[PDB]
Amino acid sequence: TDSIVKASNWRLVEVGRVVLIKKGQSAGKLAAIVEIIDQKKVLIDGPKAGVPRQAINLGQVVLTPLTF
Amino acid sequence: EVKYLYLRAVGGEVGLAPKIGPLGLSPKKVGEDIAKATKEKGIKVTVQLKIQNRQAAASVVPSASSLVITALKEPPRDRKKDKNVKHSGNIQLDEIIEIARQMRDKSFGRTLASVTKEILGTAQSVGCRVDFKNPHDIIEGINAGEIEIP
Amino acid sequence: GIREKKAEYFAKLREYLEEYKSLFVVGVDNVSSQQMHEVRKELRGRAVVLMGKNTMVRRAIRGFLSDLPDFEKLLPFVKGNVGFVFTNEPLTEIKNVIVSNRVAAGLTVVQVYDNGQVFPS
Amino acid sequence: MKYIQTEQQIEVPEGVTVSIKSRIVKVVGPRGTLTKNLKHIDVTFTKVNNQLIKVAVHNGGRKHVAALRTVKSLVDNMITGVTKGYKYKMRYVYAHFPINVNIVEKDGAKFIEVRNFLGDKKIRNVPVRDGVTIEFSTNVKDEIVLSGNSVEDVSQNAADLQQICRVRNKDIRKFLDGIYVSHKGFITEDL
Amino acid sequence: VEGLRRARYKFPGQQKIILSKKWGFTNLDRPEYLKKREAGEVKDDGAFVKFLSKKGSLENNIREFPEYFAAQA
Amino acid sequence: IIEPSLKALASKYNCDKSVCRKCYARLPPRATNCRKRKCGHTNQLRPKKKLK
RNA sequence: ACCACAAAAGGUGUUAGUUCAUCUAGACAGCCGGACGGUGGCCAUGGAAGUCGGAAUCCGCUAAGGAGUGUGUAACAACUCA
């Protein structure tokens, strides 16, 4: 018998979190969070997929479980 | 032989001893006249540390520095009739308020004679303690005789 | 004038570090004014007791790394209600004055510092 | 100001084990078990080790940080109730009419019966909640002792036993009588 | 600032209270007045101060302001 | 016969309080705020009068 | 929008901002301990020691302690506050 506080296993926004862009001209492409601006905007660039470096609101983008 | 210690107080010549010394095997009416042999100079209000050894009244006199500053002042009054305050301002005693105040058991945590001579020389609120000035503003100018008492 | 009093504290602590060499950090806890008064009266010859804010002592030690860095080993021992005793007598007589005198029913010595090292005394 | 996260740390002693699923909390210790439903408050429990659990509010306002702090206080009261237990000593006040307090069983409900409060003929009754026991004080006059696990049950039973003895239509600072909570201690004698 | 506040209630409207500059019965900002005190241009009359001018006749400007021109600090 | 060991805790629960002006409610002595929304949580207070 | 209403004053309901002071040179808050001595100062003396009442409003040790913030009391003790 121990402390059975279970998981609540999230995926987080952080420097290095890789995201999937789903709204806009980038339209479904992998990008990486470079530097996080605030609670809603981040700065991303996904250069081997083709999306340019840009600030973006976290509505237009969806987090992936991967990191680096 | 036992130890009884009391602190008697202000009285003119023979001026409620009974309630404080009934359990120490001492008198009530003879104890009031036993304090007349100490506070009779010394006609100013002071305290008396009495020490009764369970069979007699042996009262001593406590060294009081404010009463020593009152011992270098004007005593004029008799009893119950001065009609305003029974107070009197008097002579300065610029050197007598520095030897007697530095000899009253050296209290108040002093490390100098200008410390006690200002503690019991600048607390004068009944006397002026100067011929052309007043007290309580001479503590920063009294810097003589500090090495003599220490 | 608060900055002036705290700069005065810096100045006098730098003064009393660079003049004395025997340090007694004392564990004075819940001490009354009746005990401390007969400590101020008794120590008029050799030892200077310095109480005060031990968390003001932290940055005072932090700013004194340029001169005499051997006072670096005191910040873990400023913990608790402690005071300082500045004297030139190394071990015995000051420890006999502080601990043994004025007890009734806390005056101990928890740290002894002599020219760089620590001693249990 | 929408703090980005706030956290509190709950300290867990040796003899207790806690089990938190979604927001249901179960705490097991040497006096028994307690459970509490915290589904209404939106906080996340996170074990950092067997002795320490961090609670957190991510992107929360001001009310929500206050709710995090009171989650910490409630889980701490459950832990201290399952280790030590709570024990309220209440003391009677009467000038002329002696308050008479019995413990009766009425259809298996174990009511506390108050009689002769200020000479009232109304026989006052207070129910006893689950998990609280009631003793009377040895060698101290006019004292009841309620002891149990949770602070809520013990304190609310003590408040029910207090507020059943209010004084109506009189002066409350002249008629001072009632049953007041005097001491709020723990069941263990050392603490 | 808590006495005109106490009178602010016994007026209509929603008027405010600002702290004045310039020795505020006269004009002429507080550092400019402290610079004109050191020159001697500032002659005390009852409850308000007459100021020196550089366009008057010279004779009565000298006899009404003896301390401006001189070697006084 | 109250024997003021019992009366002091009574005055602790009852008498040592503060009183607001516009709403006339019982308030704690260090509290400076009324908790109600019909009076508008006003701040003017007084100490409660003791006996005589 | 016309347009079919709202005010003076408030609110520690919440958010943002200005200025000052302490400002990490451990701040406030809390808990623990102090809260000295001259000094029952001078007095009106049944009794007044901070404390029914009057004026002076000090000094030393200080890390800090008021010729004292209330209570208690024939007067003190004593708790408590800066």
**Is B111's CB within 8 Å of C44's CB?**
yes
Question: Does residue C79 approach strand G to less than 7 Å at its CB?
Answer: no
Q: Which residue is nearest to nucleotide G67 (CA to C1')?
A: B123
Only one residue has tokens 């409610």, namely F25
**Is B109's CB within 8 Å of C44's CB?**
no
Estimate in Å the CA C98 to C1' G18 gap, whole number: 54
CA distances from B54 to B19, B50, B57, E10 (A): 16, 12, 8, 77
How many whole angstroms separate alpha carbon C28 and alpha carbon C110? Answer: 9
**Is C37's CB within 8 Å of B111's CB?**
no
Question: Does residue B59 approach strand G to less than 7 Å at its CB?
Answer: no
Q: Same structural domain for residues D52 and D126?
A: no
Query: A3 touching D, CB under 8 A?
Result: yes
**Is F2's CB within 8 Å of D95's CB?**
yes
3-state secondary structure of C103: coil
Q: Same structural domain for residues D38 and D111?
A: no
Question: Does residue B85 approach strand G to less than 7 Å at its CB?
Answer: yes
Among the three residues D47, D70, D85, which one is the final residue of a domain in this structure? D85
Estimate in Å the CA B139 to C1' G78 gap, whole number: 35
- Residue type at D146? L
Q: Same structural domain for residues D134 and D165?
A: yes
Tokens read off for C7: 């700069």
Residues 51-70 of C with CB under 7 A from strand G: 51-53, 55-56, 58-59, 62
Question: Does residue C32 approach strand G to less than 7 Å at its CB?
Answer: yes
Size of interface A-D (CB pairs under 8 A): 32
Among the three residues D64, D85, D106, which one is the final residue of a domain in this structure? D85
Q: What 8-state DSSP symbol labels residue C77? A: G
Size of interface D-F (CB pairs under 8 A): 25
Among the three residues D85, D117, D151, which one is the final residue of a domain in this structure? D85
Q: Same structural domain for residues D107 and D180?
A: yes
Query: Please, which residues bridge with residue D26 across strands?
Result: D19, D35
Q: Same structural domain for residues D135 and D166?
A: yes
A-D interface (Cβ pairs under 8 Å ≥ 3): yes
Q: What is the biggest distance separating any 2 CA atoms in chain D, rounded to whole angstroms?
A: 61
> DSSP secondary structure string, C38-68?
HHHHHTSSS-EEE---TTHHHHHHHTTSSS-
Q: Which residues have CB under 8 Å from D69's CB, separation 6+?
A: D8
E-D interface (Cβ pairs under 8 Å ≥ 3): no
Q: Same structural domain for residues D189 and D98?
A: yes
Q: What 8-state DSSP symbol labels residue E17? A: -
Angle at C108 between CA C105 and CA C110, to 5 degrees: 150
> Using CB atoms and an 8 Å cut-off, which of residues 93-122 of chain D contact chain F?
93, 95
Question: Does residue E15 approach strand G to less than 7 Å at its CB?
Answer: no
User: Which segments of chain A are extended strands (E)?
Assistant: 17-21, 29-36, 41-46, 51-57, 61-67
Query: F52 touching D, CB under 8 A?
Result: no
CA atoms within 13 A on the CB side of A68: 7
Residues 100-139 of B with CB under 7 A from strand G: 104, 107-112, 115, 118-120, 122-126, 135-136, 139
Tell me the residue range of the domain where D18 lies. Answer: 1-85
Phi and psi dihedrals of B22, rounded to 5? -80, -30
Q: What is the biggest distance separating any 2 CA atoms in chain F, rounded to whole angstroms?
A: 43
How many whole angstroms separate alpha carbon E54 and alpha carbon E66? Answer: 14
3-state percent breakdown (helix, strand, coil) of chain D, nearest 5: 20, 40, 40
The secondary structure of chain B, three-state, reads CCCEEEEECCCCCCCCCCCCCCCCCCCCHHHHHHCCCCCCCCCCCCCEEEEECCCCCCECCCCCHHHHHHCCCCCCCCCCCCCCCCCCCCCCCCCHHHHCCCCCCCCCCCCCHHHHHHHCCCCCCCCCCCCCCCCCCCCCCCCCCCCCCC
**Is D93's CB within 8 Å of F6's CB?**
yes
How many whole angstroms separate alpha carbon C53 and alpha carbon C82? Answer: 9
Q: Same structural domain for residues D178 and D92?
A: yes
How many whole angstroms separate alpha carbon B124 and alpha carbon B73? Answer: 10
Q: Which residue is nearest to nucleotide G14 (CA to C1')?
A: D62
Estimate in Å the CA B25 to C1' G45 gap, whole number: 28
Report the CATH number that the domain containing residue D15 is assigned in CATH.
Answer: 3.90.930.12
Tally of domains in chain D:
2
Cα four-point dihedral sign D27, D28, D29, D32: positive
How many whole angstroms separate alpha carbon C34 and alpha carbon C12? Answer: 26
Query: C5 touching B, CB under 8 A?
Result: no
The protein footprint on chain G, as nucleotides within 7 A of a CB, is 8-16, 21-27, 32-49, 54-65, 67, 74-75
Tokens read off for D129: 């909640």
Tokens read off for B75: 């005593």
Solving technique for this entry? cryo-EM
Q: Are strands A61-67 and D52-60 parallel, antiparallel or unpaired?
A: unpaired
Q: Same structural domain for residues D145 and D187?
A: yes
Tokens read off for C110: 């928890």
What is the per-residue burial (b if ≥16 Cβ within 10 Å, else e) of B94-111? beebbebbbebebeeebe
Q: Torsion angle of alpha carbons D136, D138, D143, D148, nearest 10°?
A: -50
Q: Same structural domain for residues D162 and D119?
A: yes
Q: Which residues have CB under 8 Å from C7's CB, separation 6+?
A: none
Q: Are D182 and F9 in contact (CB under 8 A)?
A: yes
Q: Same structural domain for residues D96 and D189?
A: yes
Q: Which residues have CB under 8 Å from D138's CB, separation 6+?
A: none
Which residues of chain B does C40 touch, with a Cβ-Cβ cutoff of 8 Å?
Answer: 109
Q: Same structural domain for residues D95 and D129?
A: yes
Q: Looking at the partner chain, which of F1, F14, F15 has a beta carbon nearest the beta carbon of D95?
A: F1
How many whole angstroms separate alpha carbon D99 and alpha carbon D102? Answer: 10
**Is D53's CB within 8 Å of A3's CB?**
yes
Q: Same structural domain for residues D90 and D73?
A: no
Q: What 8-state DSSP symbol labels residue D99? A: P
Which residues of D sit within 8 Å Cβ distance of A? Answer: 2, 4, 12, 17-21, 28, 44-47, 49-50, 53, 59
Question: Does residue C33 approach strand G to less than 7 Å at its CB?
Answer: yes
